[PDB]
Design an enzyme around this catalytic site. Structure first.
Site, PDB file in Angstrom:
ATOM      1  N   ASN A 122      -1.623  -0.094   7.280  1.00 28.74           N
ATOM      2  CA  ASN A 122      -1.189  -1.441   7.527  1.00 28.74           C
ATOM      3  C   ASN A 122      -0.313  -2.093   6.452  1.00 28.74           C
ATOM      4  OD1 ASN A 122      -3.170  -2.161   5.660  1.00 28.74           O
ATOM      5  ND2 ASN A 122      -3.975  -3.776   6.954  1.00 28.74           N
TER       6      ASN A 122
ATOM      7  N   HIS B 257      -1.154  -5.626   1.399  1.00 31.71           N
ATOM      8  CA  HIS B 257      -2.388  -6.376   1.244  1.00 31.71           C
ATOM      9  C   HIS B 257      -2.106  -7.708   0.582  1.00 31.71           C
ATOM     10  CE1 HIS B 257      -6.230  -7.447  -0.782  1.00 31.71           C
ATOM     11  NE2 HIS B 257      -5.458  -7.557  -1.848  1.00 31.71           N
TER      12      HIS B 257
ATOM     13  N   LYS C 231       0.820  -1.197   0.000  1.00 35.16           N
ATOM     14  CA  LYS C 231       0.000   0.000   0.000  1.00 35.16           C
ATOM     15  C   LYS C 231       0.862   1.259   0.000  1.00 35.16           C
ATOM     16  CE  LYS C 231      -3.749  -2.011   2.591  1.00 35.16           C
ATOM     17  NZ  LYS C 231      -5.035  -1.552   3.236  1.00 35.16           N
TER      18      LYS C 231
ATOM     19  N   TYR D 198     -11.555  -2.898  -3.526  1.00 36.40           N
ATOM     20  CA  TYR D 198     -12.166  -3.156  -2.206  1.00 36.40           C
ATOM     21  C   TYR D 198     -13.693  -3.283  -2.256  1.00 36.40           C
ATOM     22  CZ  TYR D 198      -7.754  -2.187   0.237  1.00 36.40           C
ATOM     23  OH  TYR D 198      -6.462  -2.192   0.667  1.00 36.40           O
TER      24      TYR D 198
ATOM     25  N   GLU E 132      -8.420 -10.480  -7.914  1.00 37.58           N
ATOM     26  CA  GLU E 132      -7.505  -9.328  -7.754  1.00 37.58           C
ATOM     27  C   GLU E 132      -6.494  -9.272  -8.911  1.00 37.58           C
ATOM     28  OE1 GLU E 132      -6.287  -9.628  -3.435  1.00 37.58           O
ATOM     29  OE2 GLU E 132      -8.379  -9.473  -2.876  1.00 37.58           O
TER      30      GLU E 132
END
Ligand SMILES: Nc1ncnc2c1ncn2[C@@H]1O[C@H](COP(=O)(O)O)[C@@H](O)[C@H]1O
Ligand SMILES: Nc1ncnc2c1ncn2[C@@H]1O[C@H](COP(=O)(O)O)[C@@H](O)[C@H]1O
Ligand SMILES: Nc1ncnc2c1ncn2[C@@H]1O[C@H](COP(=O)(O)O)[C@@H](O)[C@H]1O
Ligand SMILES: Nc1ncnc2c1ncn2[C@@H]1O[C@H](COP(=O)(O)O)[C@@H](O)[C@H]1O
Ligand SMILES: Nc1ncnc2c1ncn2[C@@H]1O[C@H](COP(=O)(O)O)[C@@H](O)[C@H]1O
Lengths: 150, 148, 150, 150, 148
Positions: D113, D116, D10, D50, D127
Site C-alpha cells: 500500500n 505510511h 514503503k 508497528y 514515529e
C-alpha cells in the site's frame, strides 16, 4: 552501472517546492536513489563543497547562498548517472538550458539555478564522500534493473 | 523587461491556455496583463504589420481573426529571449520536444502561440493590445528565490 | 442548458503560480473560456464582491486580503458549470476538501484558499456583472461542442 | 499548529519509482519538509515502528516486508499535517481509496500500500522520535508561509 | 479478474486514450488486449444489449458507432470494481475530480469511456469485442511490488 553521482537541490529549489519534481525525473529516467537527506549547510560545509570554485570571483556569494537554507542531498546510481544527471539538469547557466531540463523549465539566473550535479565521476566520489558517511548509503537492487539495462 | 505572448485561435480551441501559462509561471516569470478576445480583421492586420509583404500574410490575418486569442504580458529578466525559447522555433517542424510548439504543434500555420521577437516588438504589441489601465503592478513574494 | 460562472484565483493563488493549473483544469473538463483578466482589486471592489457578508467577524480581513495583490478573474460557460465548477474547486474550507480538487491539492487555510467560485446561478450573474464589462465577453463556439455535449 | 507528521514511502513505493510523486504532493499542498532519509529498516526497527499491531495476523508478513528493502522516511510540518497527510494518502486499504489520493491512484493491495502516514499527532511524535535524531530535523522558514497561512 | 474498458468516440476525438491508459498502468493493472475499430450499428446494439428499454438507446447506439473507439482489457485483483472507481460515476455530474469522468466529462451522453459492470459483464464484453488470441499472456516484472 556501479557509477554514482551526487545531486543537490539548492536552497532556491527547496524553497520553491521543486524537490519532488527533481526526484521524480531521476526515478523515471531509471536511476537508483541510494542516499538522501535534508540539512542546512554550514559555511565550511559550503566552502568544502565548492573547492573546485574557491578561486572564482563569485565564490563567496555562492558559499553565502548555499549555506543560507536547507538543501537536499541525494546519491544516484546507474550506468552513466553522472553524465545523464548533468543532461537532466541542463546547462549550469539557465540562459543556456533547453526546455525539458530542470533549469530550462524552472530557472532564470545562474545564482538561483535550482540544483547541483557532480561534473565528473571523481568529483562525484568526492562529493558523495563529503556529504554522506558510508553507513548512510543503502544498497539494494531495483526489481526493474533488467527492464532498464542490457 | 516585458514580452507579449499570445495563444492563437488554434491554441485556445485546443485547450492549451492553461498549459502555456503554467510553463511561464513555473519558469519564474511574472504575469502582468491578461485577456481573451477575437481580434478583428484590422487588429490581425495591424498586429502582423511586419509580415505584410509575405505571401502567407492574408491566410495569417484571416486565421488570427477567426476566433479568440489570449493575450498576455510577462515580466522578467530576459523574458523576451527566454519566452521565445519556451515557445520553441517558429516552424513547429524545427521545434524540440520540451517546447510549446515542440509538444503541441505541427504546421507553421497553426503553431499555437505567438511571442515577441524583440523588446522593441514587445513594447509595440503590448501597447497595441493593452491600455496601461489593464497592466498590473505587483511584487512576487518569490523574487529573491528566482533572481540573485 | 446554460450557463456561466465566475472564477477568481485570489492573491495567494496568484502568488503561488497556480493560475495555469486552474485554467487547465476547467479546460480538460470541457468548459469554455469567455473572459479573463488580471487586476489588483481596490478595497471597495473587494467589499462589493464580499457584500453578502459584510456582517462577518472575518470580513475585514478578507477584504484586506482580497485587495492586497492581483487576482485573476475568469468567466466559464457550459452545461452545469456553476455546480460542476464548485466541485473542481473543492469545499470552501480546505480541511474538508478531497484531493483532486483545487483546494484539496493546494490549500490549507480557509482564508488562504486559492480560488473562488460562484455559489449559484444568481450569484454568478451578480459576480460577472460586477467584475466584467459585458461588451468584452467573447462569444465563440468551441470546435469540440458535439464531443462534449449530446 | 504547527504539527508534524511522519510519512513513509514503503519498500513497494520505492521500488515503483513513487518517491518523487509523493514528495511533490506534500509540497504542492503547502507543507514543509523538515527531515528526509533513505534506509533499509532492520527486522527490529520494523517491529518497533508497528508495535501497536504485533497481535494482528499479518504482522509477521508486514514486518518481513517492511524490512525487505529501503524505505524513505520524512517529516512534514504545517497546520494540520497529520489530518491532511492521511487525506492525501487515502484510506489505509487501497480498495477503499478514492482516485486523487496516493493509494487511490497507485495501489491495489493493502499489503502493498505504497506509503505510511501517522494516524495522529500523538503517534507522529512517537514515529518521529523513533526514526529521527532531533538534530536530523531541519529548522527553517519557508518564503511562502504568509501565502499559505492566513 | 479482467475487465473491459472502452474509450468512447468522444474520448478518442478528444485525445484521452493515453491519459486513460496511463491511469490504469500507474495503478498496477496489466494491459492484456487493445484495438481501434469503428463500431457498426449492430455491434453497438449488441454491446448495449441490456439497455434496449431506455429512451436514450437510439442516441447512444448512433453515437457509439459514429467513430472509432478504443477497446482494452485489463487484468488484476479486483479490476472490475477498481476500473469503475477509476472511471468515476456513470453521470459525470456525480463524478468526483480525480476520476476520468470527474476530470474530463460534463454530459452522460458524452461520458468519455466505459467499464464493465461486473465480472459476468466483463467476461461477456471481452468475448464480444476480442477474439481469444488477441489477448496476450504475460507476467509483469512488478507483480510482487503490487500484490502480497
Ligand atoms: N554570480 C555568479 N556569476 C557567474 N557564475 C556563477 C555565479 N554564481 C554561481 N555561478 C556558477 O555556479 C556554478 C557552481 O556549480 P553548481 O553548484 O553546479 O551551480 C559555477 O559553475 C558558476 O558558473
Ligand atoms: N503558411 C505559412 N508559410 C510559411 N511561413 C508561415 C506561414 N504561416 C505563418 N508563417 C510564419 O509565421 C511567423 C509569424 O510570427 P508568429 O506570430 O510567431 O506566428 C513567421 O515567422 C512566418 O515564418
Ligand atoms: N478567517 C476566516 N474564518 C472563517 N472563514 C473564512 C475566513 N476567511 C475567509 N473565510 C471564508 O471565505 C469564504 C468566501 O468565499 P470565496 O469567495 O470562495 O473566498 C466564506 O464562505 C468564509 O467561510
Ligand atoms: N494482510 C492484511 N490484511 C488486512 N490488513 C492489512 C494486511 N497487511 C497490512 N494491513 C494493514 O496495514 C495497516 C498498517 O498501517 P500503515 O502503516 O498505515 O499501512 C493496518 O491497519 C492493516 O489494516
Ligand atoms: N438522457 C440521457 N441521454 C443519454 N445517455 C443517458 C441519459 N440518461 C442516462 N444515460 C446513460 O448513458 C449511459 C451509457 O453507458 P456507459 O457504457 O456507462 O457509458 C447509460 O449507463 C445511461 O445511464
Amino acid at each position: 552501472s556501479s557509477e554514482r553521482t551526487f545531486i543537490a537541490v539548492k536552497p532556491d529549489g527547496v524553497q520553491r517546492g521543486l524537490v519532488g519534481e527533481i526526484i521524480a525525473r531521476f526515478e523515471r529516467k531509471g536511476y537508483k536513489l541510494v542516499a538522501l537527506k535534508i540539512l542546512q549547510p554550514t559555511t565550511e560545509q559550503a566552502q568544502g563543497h565548492y573547492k573546485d570554485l574557491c578561486s572564482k570571483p563569485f565564490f563567496p556569494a555562492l558559499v553565502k547562498y548555499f549555506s543560507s537554507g536547507p538543501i537536499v542531498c541525494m546519491v544516484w546510481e546507474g550506468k552513466n548517472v553522472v553524465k545523464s544527471g548533468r543532461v537532466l539538469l541542463g546547462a549550469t547557466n539557465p540562459a543556456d538550458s533547453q526546455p525539458g531540463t530542470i533549469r530550462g523549465d524552472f530557472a532564470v539566473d545562474v545564482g538561483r539555478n535550482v540544483c547541483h550535479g557532480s561534473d565528473s565521476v571523481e568529483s562525484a566520489e568526492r562529493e558523495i564522500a563529503f556529504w554522506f558517511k558510508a553507513d548512510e548509503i543503502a544498497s539494494w537492487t531495483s526489481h526493474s534493473v533488467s527492464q532498464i539495462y542490457e
